[PDB]
Amino acid sequence: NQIDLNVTCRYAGVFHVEKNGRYSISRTEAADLCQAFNSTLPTMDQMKLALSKGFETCRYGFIEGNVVIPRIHPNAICAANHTGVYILVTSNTSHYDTYCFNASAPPEEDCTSVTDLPNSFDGPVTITIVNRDGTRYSKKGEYRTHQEDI
Ligand SMILES: Nc1cccc2c1CN(CCCOC1CCOCC1)CC2
């Protein structure tokens, strides 16, 4: 019973989380996952500020209200070469990665590793935070509050 959470640097508190190396998070699970990081889904304004501080990914993820990809540099295989906060308009499907916003993070780029999942609850799952530099932090717990996600 294992979940891996790959996390990015934070930019103005905003970061990206990918579950188990594939698009696999529902909107309800996304909210719960951010809550486990003492975080919330970012607003569009929070995401725009993060983008301005250097945040970009090549992955769709939830924010409050939309599914987006922040892009700084045009790349043909990331958000169809767009820059800015690219908003997904048309999709059949419901599972993506997520973004999260931590108000207590530093104001600009924080590329230190994440070494805690401070608001996980008691549970049976081995949850492993995986940083981009490979450093890991694991704990037994749960974060999902909706049965249809479990
Ligand atoms: N942040 C982090 C921490 C630990 C592991 C990983 C990450 C970030 N993942 C980046 C995934 C990028 O995939 C792109 C999307 C499709 O085009 C190829 C690149 C790759 C795996």
Curated annotation (Swiss-Prot):
* Tissue and organ distribution: Expressed in the intestinal epithelium.
Domain named Link is located at 13-102
Q: Which cysteines are joined by disulfide bonds?
A: C9-C111, C34-C100, C58-C78
Annotated glycosylation sites: N6, N38, N81, N92, N102
Q: Where in the cell is it found?
A: Cell membrane; Cell projection, Microvillus; Secreted
Q: What does the UniProt record tell us about how this protein is modified after translation?
A: N-glycosylated. O-glycosylated; contains chondroitin sulfate glycans which can be more or less sulfated.
Binding locations of hyaluronan? R22, R59, Y60, Y86
User: Where does this protein have coiled-coil stretches?
Assistant: none
Superkingdom classification of source: Eukaryota
Subunit composition and interactions:
Interacts with PKN2. Interacts with TIAM1 and TIAM2. Interacts with HA, as well as other glycosaminoglycans, collagen, laminin, and fibronectin via its N-terminal segment. Interacts with UNC119. Interacts with PDPN (via extracellular domain); this interaction is required for PDPN-mediated directional migration and regulation of lamellipodia extension/stabilization during cell spreading and migration. Interacts with RDX, EZR and MSN (via FERM domain). Interacts with EGFR. Interacts with CD74; this complex is essential for the MIF-induced signaling cascade that results in B cell survival.
In the record's own words, the domains note is: The lectin-like LINK domain is responsible for hyaluronan binding.
Main role? Answer: Cell-surface receptor that plays a role in cell-cell interactions, cell adhesion and migration, helping them to sense and respond to changes in the tissue microenvironment. Participates thereby in a wide variety of cellular functions including the activation, recirculation and homing of T-lymphocytes, hematopoiesis, inflammation and response to bacterial infection.
Return the protein name.
CD44 antigen
Q: Which gene holds the coding sequence for this protein?
A: Cd44
**Interval of the full protein contained in this chain:** 22 to 171 of 778
